[PDB]
Each structure stands twice: as C-alpha cells, then as structure tokens.
C-alpha cells in the first residue's frame, strides 16, 4: 500500500506512571500553562540569565515552522563564538582594526 | 548502475565540433555510426521533444 509507509517502525513509549515533578495540576482556580516549565521559569533571572537558548552566533538558529521556538539547523551541535572569527579576534571580528562601519568607510 | 555510460554523453558535443571543423560526419564507419547513433538516442533530444 502507499500507506504501508506510515506504519510505526519502533514500539512507542507507554504511559506507565504519574505526572512529572512539579506538574501543572490545577485546583479550584488555577491559571495553568502546559507550555511553561514550572521549575525553570520560577528560577531567578539573576541566576539563570535572560537566555532562552544557548548563547551562540544566531546563524546556527532557524525560526521554526509551526512552532513558536527556534531550532538548530545542525541537530544539537553547537559551535561557540570563537569559531566564527579568526583566531584571537578582538570582539569576534573579521579583522580587529575597526567595527563594521569603520571598515566600510575606511574602504571607501 | 554502470557509471561509465556517462561517457557516451560526450558524443553529441564531439559531433557538433566535427561540424565546426568541416569533418563530414558521413565518413565514419557503418559500425561506428551505429554505435554513435545509439549513443545519440540515449542522450540527445531537441527543444521540440
């Protein structure tokens, strides 16, 4: 069948047991997001920092289709900022002498 | 597959050169012209077709 393609190759994980630690469970009046992680948002911005995703040159991220979130165009691999620039590049920069605009008008 | 068949696809280029060079294509052995005609019908087609 054409549909023979859409079978499950592997046995899917069963639901054996209870809701996870600090699950959203709603009592008499509760405003509940299934979406927001209960434990990792409660954790202070001072400590964890404003980052939603790893701090990496953004070329590695893609704005997802159908999901409000970004993903990495190489699954899960990450290259640090240091790998975008030349070795020991001041403020990782193609060349250390000037900022982008400085480079433009020097060139002109 | 058998890769080296791609070579036959050179042929319609060579034939074109033979016309630029003034080598008449009808002096080619009957034999070779059979093999070439085959090679053609594999890779050559016109804008019409």
């Amino acid at each position: 069948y054409y549909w023979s393609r859409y079978r499950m190759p592997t046995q899917m994980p069963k639901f054996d047991g209870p809701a996870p630690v600090a699950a959203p469970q709603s009592m008499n009046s509760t405003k509940t997001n299934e979406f927001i992680d209960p434990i990792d948002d409660k954790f202070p911005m001072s400590i964890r920092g404003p980052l939603v995703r790893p701090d990496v040159p953004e070329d590695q991220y893609v704005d997802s289709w159908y999901i409000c979130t970004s993903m990495t165009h190489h699954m899960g691999d990450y290259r640090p900022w240091s790998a975008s620039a030349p070795p020991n590049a001041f403020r990782f920069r193609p060349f250390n002498e000037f900022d982008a605009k400085g480079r433009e008008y020097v060139q002109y | 597959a058998n890769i080296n068949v791609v070579e036959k696809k050179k042929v319609p280029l060579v034939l074109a050169q033979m016309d630029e060079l003034g080598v008449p294509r009808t002096h080619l052995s009957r034999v070779l012209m059979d093999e070439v005609e085959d090679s053609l019908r594999k890779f050559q087609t016109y804008r019409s077709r």
């Binding site: 023979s4 393609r5 079978r7 190759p9 592997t10 899917m12 699954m75 | -």
Partner: protein, 49 residues
C-alpha cells in the same frame, strides 16, 4: 528511540552479514513477503513466508 526521518534506500546498505544468515537463500529457500489476512491487533502487518 524514535525515528526523526525516513528514507527509502537499497537493502544492500544494511543487510545481515553473510556469515550470520543461512547459506544461499535464493536457491535453498522459497520466500514470499505477504500480508496477514486476519486482523493484527499489534505487530507487523507483513510477514515473511
């Protein structure tokens, strides 16, 4: 594990190593891949007869 992607690729990429599988299969075994007629609750809808 779960499948992130799916591709149709020839079976000779991964096939059980010749020393693991029975000797010449084409010649000594008649194999047909066919579909169960009965309703299969779970498991595969095809089997090798």
């Amino acid at each position: 594990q779960g499948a992130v992607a799916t591709a149709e690729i020839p079976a000779f990429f991964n096939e059980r190593p010749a020393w693991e599988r029975p000797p010449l299969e084409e010649t000594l075994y008649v194999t047909t891949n066919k579909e169960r007629y009965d309703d299969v609750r779970g498991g595969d809808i095809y089997y090798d007869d």
